[PDB]
Amino acid sequence: QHQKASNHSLHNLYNLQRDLLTVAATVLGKQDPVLTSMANQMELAKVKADRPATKQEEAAAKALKKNLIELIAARTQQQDGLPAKEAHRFAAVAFRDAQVKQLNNQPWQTIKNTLTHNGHHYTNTQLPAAEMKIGAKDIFPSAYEGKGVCSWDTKNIHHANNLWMSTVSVHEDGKDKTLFCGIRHGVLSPYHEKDPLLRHVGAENKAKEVLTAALFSKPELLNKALAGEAVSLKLVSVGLLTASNIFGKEGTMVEDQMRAWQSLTQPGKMIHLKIRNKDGDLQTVKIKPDVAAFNVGVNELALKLGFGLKASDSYNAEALHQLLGNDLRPEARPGGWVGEWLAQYPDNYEVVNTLARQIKDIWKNNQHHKDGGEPYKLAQRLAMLAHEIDAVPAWNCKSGKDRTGMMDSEIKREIISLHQTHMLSAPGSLPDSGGQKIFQKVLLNSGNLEIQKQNTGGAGNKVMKNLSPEVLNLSYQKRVGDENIWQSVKGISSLITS
């Protein structure tokens, strides 16, 4: 039971069929002996020795979901005579609903991992939204009660989808110095809500929840706000959607998110938030928000053939003026939020100046429109700069686990590399040997794999594709200088067509 496969180890599938069978049993009622039939064969395979993933095993696992849908449709027709099209449509909707319910009810817990390199110890922590608590209850108004929201729950109007707080720290002098802390979430718009009014309202509630989490990241601000004083908060939001409606309605997703941020940062408008204090009682606090909203796009659809570049740049221009001022020449002096931070003369000036210069360079040559060996060149630096000047960085994807996970790994790699008193790497450059070793360790020892499994049932990443015309690939083979590690990051991700 231990001869692990080169790809798709038997135990990973072993878990996958059980989850799908449980959903089917829930919808039916744990009475069909047919379900017990392959369940018994599954229990037989439980004690079987681990094997390389034969094509039969992969095909059986891949087609299991479709077979279950067909079985449900047959049961539906027998119980109630319906046409095949109507039964199939109804069965698919019911099956998806049951899966979201089950995935939502499982416990959500913090994830901790340890990484060692060059005699240094780093810790990565992923704190789920259900664990952000002062006292004994989560701070959010609509309580989580130890449960969460999955990326597939696209009709929820009360909660942000996949909300985590990501932290990396290094152990020194018997203490833990925090090196980076950020907020990762899903997109801020409910997808399949039809009423535009409910769509806008749902986006508002989700955005407020992200703001609540960001406030929790700064305990001193949280204490001041709980003391009854209005608090100013600065947030930098980075979206990773391609912003074109041609293939998957990611365009309207973007305007929904941007509209939500605008409605919360209306000038002179003070925002009221509800927070569970240490006594478990809802309490109202007053926030003066300030959000710089970005969207970049890191897909092949945006980098190879190029979609929504013009649409996104209209948003990015405003955000840069908000962040760096009205003069974006690379040799000028920084303004905006960066200028205000530097006016205090902090001992941080070296890193801040370098990051601002590099960002202006990328913007000037439009280097973010291509992937000169590394596609997250602009997003990664925006997040790092935001943390330096004491803002709160937040980034999101469509579902908050694939592209979000990749950007999480990129940021952690750069922070760790910089912590060794180094400088920053140049834009659009492949990592060297030491950087590659850092990146390989990060990709496996970060909490992304557990987030993947928690949110889906299998570990993997959809960013790793290997398309058929070789000019359409994003070049992670070079950034991750290892075939086996690259195949390990992309786990069961190809078997989750859903």
Place this chain on the structure above:
Amino acid sequence: QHQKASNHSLHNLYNLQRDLLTVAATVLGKQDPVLTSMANQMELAKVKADRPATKQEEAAAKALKKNLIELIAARTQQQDGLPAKEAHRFAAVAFRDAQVKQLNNQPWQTIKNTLTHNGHHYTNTQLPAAEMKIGAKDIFPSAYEGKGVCSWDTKNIHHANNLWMSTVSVHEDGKDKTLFCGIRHGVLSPYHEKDPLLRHVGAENKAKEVLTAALFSKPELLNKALAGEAVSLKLVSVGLLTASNIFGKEGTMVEDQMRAWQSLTQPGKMIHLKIRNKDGDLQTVKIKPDVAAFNVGVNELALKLGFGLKASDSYNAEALHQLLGNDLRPEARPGGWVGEWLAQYPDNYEVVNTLARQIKDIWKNNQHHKDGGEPYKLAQRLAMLAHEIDAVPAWNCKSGKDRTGMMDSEIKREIISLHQTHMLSAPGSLPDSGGQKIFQKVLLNSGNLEIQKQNTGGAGNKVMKNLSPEVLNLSYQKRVGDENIWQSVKGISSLITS
């Protein structure tokens, strides 16, 4: 033997397998009894009654070519021990070479069709390059001898690929008044030649051949040139390639064609052509060419998601200045070649003015970047205008049968519609009921289907696709207001993966 299928009639396939089997027999040597095995079953199916195209018949025909390649590889390995990869590569090259040879050696003959509408009789004629003759031999230097060049012969450096002269005329007063005459060919560059020097030379020879055909379209000019006098010739060339290298190397194809035209129209450079006179003797004539070269792109790759629009417009700007002058405002007066034609005060002024105005309108609003219901809006008008002002229109595709055939049909429909003393339709407008009837008759009664069969072995058109995301379709369902006719134009075209 007559119960025709709704799609893929049995007789069409019936011909297809025989052609493929003949090629395989040629490479092997008509000795393998295995070939005789399914040949005998094929002869058994010869007398069988016609049937609807069952999925088994379509699948067997579709996979026959792959099976034949595998059989050749097996024979190769048995005769000479080679690895599977080497044998497979060699077998594919040999099979393609044999097919091109056989398709080249078949006779090429003129195609004539008759169309009737509203008490009028029209005739469509397709004259192949091997039939353009004065005396008893084709005018081209490297004689065709009644044979031709196929679209798959991509390494030929002596001949233009798929050269035809297309004519539509109406019968009146016991006479035949010519309404339109043009030249359709394949692309002017040899694809797979590796030496850049031979690539440029081959493009030169092909372009000279197109010029020779164009001269033959004007008997008075041909007679003057044969009398020893230098002759001025005006030609308008329209390319229909998308001009991007992302998917299929159609970009480099375009620069090769444009470079060839430039080398023939070098200022002050007089061109010498060889022509077989009425006595079968090569004779040299002197031409003063003048070519306006265009490229538009009419694919989904260019119209829906948009490729090479910027690349092509750099060429189109120069060509328009050559054709209409330096002022392209829609209300200005025409200049360039159009201005010179109008300065003679012809009785043709009404049509010419309308066409020039519409072209400027399309150019101003960039309407050719989308398909507002009809994608050939700019190409079709360029060809019609060229014929009006006594130039020679010529258009080409990658292979010269699919997109070329569709543009052929579009032009014929508009000419016939206009001949009834009407006006021209507005840009980007669907045809009305009468126009739809005209278009339906043209698409079937033009010679395109026979060109398809001659050049490939099966009738069809690759422009008719019906892609899976509905926003990626070119909207011919509306232009051709008939499902059955649309399915008839797209014949065996989907079974010619080659």
